[PDB]
Design an enzyme around this catalytic site. Sequence first.
Site, PDB file in Angstrom:
ATOM      1  N   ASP A  82      -5.183  34.090  10.583  1.00 22.47           N
ATOM      2  CA  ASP A  82      -4.051  34.131   9.631  1.00 22.47           C
ATOM      3  C   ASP A  82      -2.672  33.804  10.665  1.00 22.47           C
ATOM      4  OD1 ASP A  82      -0.982  35.041   7.549  1.00 22.47           O
ATOM      5  OD2 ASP A  82      -1.419  36.771   8.836  1.00 22.47           O
ATOM      6  N   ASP A 104      -1.083  26.680   9.803  1.00 19.61           N
ATOM      7  CA  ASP A 104       0.103  26.866   9.230  1.00 19.61           C
ATOM      8  C   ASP A 104       1.224  25.721   9.808  1.00 19.61           C
ATOM      9  OD1 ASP A 104       2.873  27.890   9.173  1.00 19.61           O
ATOM     10  OD2 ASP A 104       3.053  29.725  10.369  1.00 19.61           O
ATOM     11  N   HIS A 210       3.461  35.794   1.260  1.00 23.18           N
ATOM     12  CA  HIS A 210       3.108  35.401   2.501  1.00 23.18           C
ATOM     13  C   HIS A 210       4.764  36.863   2.702  1.00 23.18           C
ATOM     14  CE1 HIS A 210       0.973  33.820   5.687  1.00 23.18           C
ATOM     15  NE2 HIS A 210       1.061  32.849   4.468  1.00 23.18           N
ATOM     16  N   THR A 254      -0.431  42.051   3.268  1.00 19.54           N
ATOM     17  CA  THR A 254       0.351  42.602   4.152  1.00 19.54           C
ATOM     18  C   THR A 254      -0.014  43.295   4.653  1.00 19.54           C
ATOM     19  OG1 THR A 254       0.097  43.208   0.745  1.00 19.54           O
ATOM     20  CG2 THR A 254       0.666  44.548   3.053  1.00 19.54           C
ATOM     21  N   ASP A 255       0.845  43.370   5.967  1.00 18.90           N
ATOM     22  CA  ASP A 255       1.003  44.220   7.549  1.00 18.90           C
ATOM     23  C   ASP A 255       1.870  45.163   7.769  1.00 18.90           C
ATOM     24  OD1 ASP A 255       0.045  44.082  10.191  1.00 18.90           O
ATOM     25  OD2 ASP A 255       1.601  42.566  10.154  1.00 18.90           O
TER      26      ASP A 255
HETATM   27  O1  LIG Z   1       2.686  37.613   5.318  1.00 16.56           O
HETATM   28  C1  LIG Z   1       2.060  38.283   5.981  1.00 16.56           C
HETATM   29  C2  LIG Z   1       2.738  39.881   5.953  1.00 16.56           C
HETATM   30  O2  LIG Z   1       4.000  40.478   5.601  1.00 16.56           O
HETATM   31  P1  LIG Z   1       4.903  42.024   5.863  1.00 16.56           P
HETATM   32  O3  LIG Z   1       5.586  41.419   7.319  1.00 16.56           O
HETATM   33  O4  LIG Z   1       5.797  41.610   4.664  1.00 16.56           O
HETATM   34  O5  LIG Z   1       3.751  42.596   5.587  1.00 16.56           O
HETATM   35  N1  LIG Z   1       0.977  37.949   7.450  1.00 16.56           N
HETATM   36  O6  LIG Z   1       0.825  36.916   7.582  1.00 16.56           O
HETATM   37  C3  LIG Z   1       0.936  38.689   8.343  1.00 16.56           C
HETATM   38  C4  LIG Z   1       1.284  38.898   9.133  1.00 16.56           C
HETATM   39  C5  LIG Z   1       1.073  38.096  10.889  1.00 16.56           C
HETATM   40  C6  LIG Z   1       2.118  38.933  12.190  1.00 16.56           C
HETATM   41  O7  LIG Z   1       1.178  39.647  12.938  1.00 16.56           O
HETATM   42  P2  LIG Z   1       1.167  39.043  14.530  1.00 16.56           P
HETATM   43  O8  LIG Z   1       2.555  40.262  15.391  1.00 16.56           O
HETATM   44  O9  LIG Z   1      -0.362  40.013  14.904  1.00 16.56           O
HETATM   45  O10 LIG Z   1       1.109  37.275  14.142  1.00 16.56           O
HETATM   46 CA   LIG Z   2       5.385  29.668   9.062  1.00 18.58          CA
HETATM   47 NA    NA Z   3      -2.615  33.604   5.620  1.00 19.19          NA
HETATM   48 ZN   LIG Z   4       2.129  35.306   6.995  1.00 22.93          ZN
END
Ligand SMILES: O=C(COP(=O)(O)O)N(O)CCCCOP(=O)(O)O
Ligand SMILES: [Ca+2]
Ligand code: NA
Ligand SMILES: [Zn+2]
Lengths: 307, 295
Positions: A82, A104, A210, A254-255
């Site tokens: 990611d 990215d 995202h 989704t995180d």
């Molecule tokens: O698009 C998303 C998640 O979206 P959400 O915040 O709505 O769940 N993702 O890309 C996941 C987010 C990654 C960030 O984690 P770190 O702090 O370890 O860099």
């Molecule tokens: Ca970006």
């Molecule tokens: Na991604």
């Molecule tokens: Zn993201």
Amino acid sequence: MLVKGNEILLKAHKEGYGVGAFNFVNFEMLNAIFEAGNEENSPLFIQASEGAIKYMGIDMAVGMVKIMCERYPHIPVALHLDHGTTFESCEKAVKAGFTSVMIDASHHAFEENLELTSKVVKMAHNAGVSVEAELGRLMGIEDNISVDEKDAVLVNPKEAEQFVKESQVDYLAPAIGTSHGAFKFKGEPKLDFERLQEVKRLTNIPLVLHGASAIPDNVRKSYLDAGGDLKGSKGVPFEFLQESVKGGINKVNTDTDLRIAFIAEVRKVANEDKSQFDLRKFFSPAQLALKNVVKERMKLLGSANKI
Amino acid sequence: MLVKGNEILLKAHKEGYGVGAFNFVNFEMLNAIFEAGNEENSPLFIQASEGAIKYMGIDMAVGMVKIMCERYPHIPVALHLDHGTTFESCEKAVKAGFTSVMIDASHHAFEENLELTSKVVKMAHNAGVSVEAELGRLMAVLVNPKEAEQFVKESQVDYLAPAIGTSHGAFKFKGEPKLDFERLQEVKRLTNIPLVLHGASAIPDNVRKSYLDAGGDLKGSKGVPFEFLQESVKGGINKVNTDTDLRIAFIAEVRKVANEDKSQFDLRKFFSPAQLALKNVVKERMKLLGSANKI
Ligand SMILES: O=C(COP(=O)(O)O)N(O)CCCCOP(=O)(O)O
Ligand SMILES: [Ca+2]
Ligand code: NA
Ligand SMILES: [Zn+2]
Ligand SMILES: O=C(COP(=O)(O)O)N(O)CCCCOP(=O)(O)O
Ligand SMILES: [Ca+2]
Ligand code: NA
Ligand SMILES: [Zn+2]
């Protein structure tokens, strides 16, 4: 089994459903995500950011995933980097055994993003791994935003058409109004579904959303009941996520929802028994709450029973 | 690298030091334990109970440990089934890649215990893994040195856990700490093998304080004093089971983070400090037991 990401998303694209891409930073998150995939009979993207890789060590990230895939060989799983930020990072992920990588470079000018993205693609495709790239800025289109300054923030669909044609990227994350974290909208949620549909029409590849956490009412409730602070938080409504899938989103990152659900239970155990220090008594309820978030999301996006 | 438990304990036995045996239930505990070993240059017994194996899956328990051993190849590591309760459980562990197993039938009659232990030892030795067994009640009721002498000769177990006054968890003594060091030394004299102390947590002052400062309750808790642990190693203890101390240290930091920022829900922000406190408990214990700088 562990498979290249594009094998999962091409199926989603053709059949018109979305596949949750869930972030993990340790064993408990990973286990709960896989159990959800097993119970809903759903394919899965399992993702780790560069910071999560730093936290776990890339050997452990990949290692734990491969063990989980061996535990549940019937679940199609893509292991996905990611927000890769450099060619070098995507390269390490390929060598380590990731089957999908995001490069990215959306903050770079269009020519630089396309150049860096094409370089990753050539490397990844040679190794049989799929690639995601991104166009647009992942921030909220505030009300009173200039009609033009909006086109300087969100994905430019004509840019997206050329970007995909020249780079040969497998899937694209077009910014349409979401952003990372619990604080997505001041006021009523709004996404540029017209923009999304235009990108989908122009590119005809799987698309990625995202910042797609919803902050479900039951999850907010659990977190608040346990004494946590979520003031001002607003997620993407369930209705918007379904609309996104209808409009061509096939991968849904989704995180935040997972972490709120998980930590809410940790806080609750700490609150309710001051003498408790068995880690499993904290992390078993936390896993269950996270698993439940994932299962409901799988049903919502339509990936349930798609294995 | 990953080695049979006897490789580690025999050295400790010959050179007269104690090797901490630390339980884990997930990645954070396992990583902090290994980082402790790396920073104090110490061999490691990493153990998982039947409960922890249920929690992680035996496939994940072994897999994670092997990954860590490849990350720190210079550290001698034994992967140990803590408190196996049946032959079948011990056999699953051997088959999954454990290099040490406890078969605990201490609560049975001496005869049943020796019988079951001899069965495990036969299977395990056939597969090149070491075996621990236990005699006595961990709370007459302590180990019988003459039983131990016979038990070891007939069963051929590699190491023995003799009950001498300890017990599991944070509440080891109603009053003042006492261990039967006389009994320990007699067992050592008659068996001449590495010995194992269970219930070896100390509940150190800094850890107790971090836990209480974080809102926790440890009223009445008492562990084995550092001085007693050292006396145990001198008496012939070579493997020192330590679990409670790590969990209190770890959870103390989790509680603190929860207390100090209600908006925090990044798991790493909770578990990074918790790992550091756990690592630090283990480092100090490595120094105390004398396994530090033995690599
Ligand atoms: O698009 C998303 C998640 O979206 P959400 O915040 O709505 O769940 N993702 O890309 C996941 C987010 C990654 C960030 O984690 P770190 O702090 O370890 O860099
Ligand atoms: Ca970006
Ligand atoms: Na991604
Ligand atoms: Zn993201
Ligand atoms: O002797 C000990 C530990 O002694 P200590 O409690 O003084 O640390 N050990 O054998 C460790 C006990 C592990 C038990 O964990 P489960 O609840 O998963 O069965
Ligand atoms: Ca016992
Ligand atoms: Na043991
Ligand atoms: Zn024990």
